[PDB]
Design brief:
The complex is a heterotetramer, with three copies of chain A and one copy of chain B (about 375 residues). Helices cover about 0% and strands about 0% of the residues of chain A. Chain A has no helices and no strands. With about 375 residues, chain B is α+β, with helices and mostly antiparallel strands. Chain B folds into two domains: about 170 residues, Collagenase (Catalytic Domain) (3-Layer(aba) Sandwich); about 190 residues, Hemopexin (4 Propeller), CATH 2.110.10. Chain B has five helices and 25 strands. Chain B has a five-stranded mixed β-sheet, with helices on one face. In chain B, helix 1 packs across helix 2. Chain B is elongated. Classes of the chains: A little secondary structure (about 35), B alpha+beta (about 375). At the A-D interface, loops of A face loops of D. The structure holds calcium ion (4 copies) and zinc ion (2 copies). The site of one calcium ion has 3 residues of chain B, from loops. The site of one zinc ion (ZN) has 4 residues of chain B, from helix 2. Chain B: It comes from Homo sapiens (Human). Chain B: This is Interstitial collagenase. It is classed as hydrolase/peptide.
Chain lengths: ~35, ~375, ~35, ~40
């Protein structure tokens, strides 16, 4: 018996996983001076 | 680790590969080498061998291609998917295609060919993506200059083929488990509001707004820091985090290593050369008093005066009763000092110099 | 004949979205006197 | 003599590569004023 044909393609590949949450922003400079 | 579905493997122990075409990104030799070396990481831990035939049909055809290329899995241009490989088998079987649209390098720059190749070749031998974040077989490109198989990749690959005939027997780095007693630390810092604990080439990110501990390669944020840190402390005043490794340190401003590091600790701080390294460190809330622990003695540095304080080689066992003889890590949070040694964490009270609460090192997590 | 070539590999998956941006740094300290 | 049937499907394409670290957030607000100086 003659060899058959190839099967279809494997199902889609999984979506890639999300990324790592970015690092927190830099702390704000200190407030202004005080009212004498 | 995960063995590809269907358990594809090669029947022939002596394989051959071929670099069909080349990328105009790196000199043909740097590529031959990069691939040569990569194939070695796998053969180093198995009975397998990888010979390179310069023409004809090889068991693994390596090529560089763009977008669509007669193979069902088109590339996405720059970024994202860097490459793919097919499980073992005849014809297209066991092949590797690198997304040419990428800038392939032989350095630290984005997309070091060697590091991306070692992964691909994992699929080419019969391995699939590992759920272990520290494995080479983890669907994520990270790179700290070095490229090795993690104990996980070694186990998985030897599950398919067996061990190297080498008499010594190679071993890889193991990944830490947040909730596992016996877990210990190298350094603990408070980078910007959160707290990051370090263990090997990994960090465990703890943030108040979120419930989960995040484990990952320290290289995610800082590729150029040295592997295996010794101490680390944040200095609010100058939004800086200093990491220590032996006789010198690195200053990081958020996500960027400052210009000029590493830098020796003796010149920058003033330690005796008898101190070959720092064991732990933490700096006062706002008083600018950084403490560096060295074995059973500690030093206090005045951040503002940029110089040590009056005769400070003091014993820890005095100004800090109880805590112990050695410190692995330390950090200040809520006016309290949390000392870490071995598996125990002490909640030291600076105000009344008293050990308030002994507790598990991993206690700070959700276990 | 042979019930045959197993068939080609399915296509690779999309790349995952970037990582969410981090929070806005803690407010500054109360200025000097 | 007769041509055999079709082979099985195909291996599922490999998963997608992971995302990319997030940008670090923006700096915070400036702090509140400071206590009164001289009278
Ligand atoms: Ca092949
Ligand atoms: Ca790409
Ligand atoms: Ca290119
Ligand atoms: Ca340490
Ligand atoms: Zn391809
Ligand atoms: Zn992969």
């Amino acid at each position: 018996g003659p060899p058959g044909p190839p099967g279809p393609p494997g199902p889609q590949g999984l979506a890639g996983q999300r990324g790592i949450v970015g690092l927190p922003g830099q702390r704000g400079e200190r407030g202004p001076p005080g009212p004498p | 680790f995960v063995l590809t579905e269907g358990n594809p493997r090669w029947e022939q122990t002596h394989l051959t590969y071929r670099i069909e075409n080349y990328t105009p990104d790196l000199p043909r030799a740097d590529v031959d080498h990069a691939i040569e070396k990569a194939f070695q990481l796998w053969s180093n831990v198995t009975p397998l061998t990888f010979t390179k035939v310069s023409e004809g049909q090889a068991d693994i055809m390596i090529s560089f291609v763009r977008g669509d290329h007669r193979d069902n899995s088109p590339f996405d241009g720059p970024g994202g998917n860097l490459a793919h490989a097919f499980q073992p088998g005849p014809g297209i079987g066991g092949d590797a295609h690198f997304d040419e649209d990428e800038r392939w390098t032989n350095n630290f720059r984005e997309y070091n060919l060697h590091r991306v190749a070692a992964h691909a070749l994992g699929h080419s031998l019969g391995l699939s993506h590992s759920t272990d974040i520290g494995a080479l077989m983890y669907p994520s490109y990270t790179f700290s200059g070095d490229v090795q198989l993690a104990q996980d990749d070694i186990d998985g690959i030897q599950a398919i083929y067996g061990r190297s005939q080498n008499p010594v027997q190679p071993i890889g780095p193991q990944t830490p488990k947040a909730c596992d007693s016996k877990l210990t630390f190298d350094a603990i810092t408070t980078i910007r509001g959160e707290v990051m604990f370090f263990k090997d080439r990994f960090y465990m990110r703890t943030n108040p707004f979120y419930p989960e501990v995040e484990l990952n390669f320290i290289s995610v944020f800082w590729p150029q820091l040295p592997n295996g840190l010794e101490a680390a402390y944040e200095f609010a005043d100058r939004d800086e985090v200093r990491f220590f490794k032996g006789n010198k340190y690195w200053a990081v401003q958020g996500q960027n290593v400052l210009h000029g590091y590493p830098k020796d600790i003796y010149s920058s701080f003033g330690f005796p050369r008898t101190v070959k390294h720092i064991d732990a460190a933490l700096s006062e809330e706002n008083t600018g008093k950084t403490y560096f622990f060295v074995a059973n003695k500690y030093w206090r540095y005045d951040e503002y005066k940029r110089s040590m304080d009056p005769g400070y080689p003091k014993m820890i066992a005095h100004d800090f009763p109880g805590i112990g003889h050695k410190v692995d890590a330390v950090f200040m949070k809520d006016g309290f000092f949390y000392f870490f040694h071995g598996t125990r964490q002490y909640k030291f009270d600076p105000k009344t110099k008293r050990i308030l609460t002994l507790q598990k090192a991993n206690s700070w997590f959700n276990c």
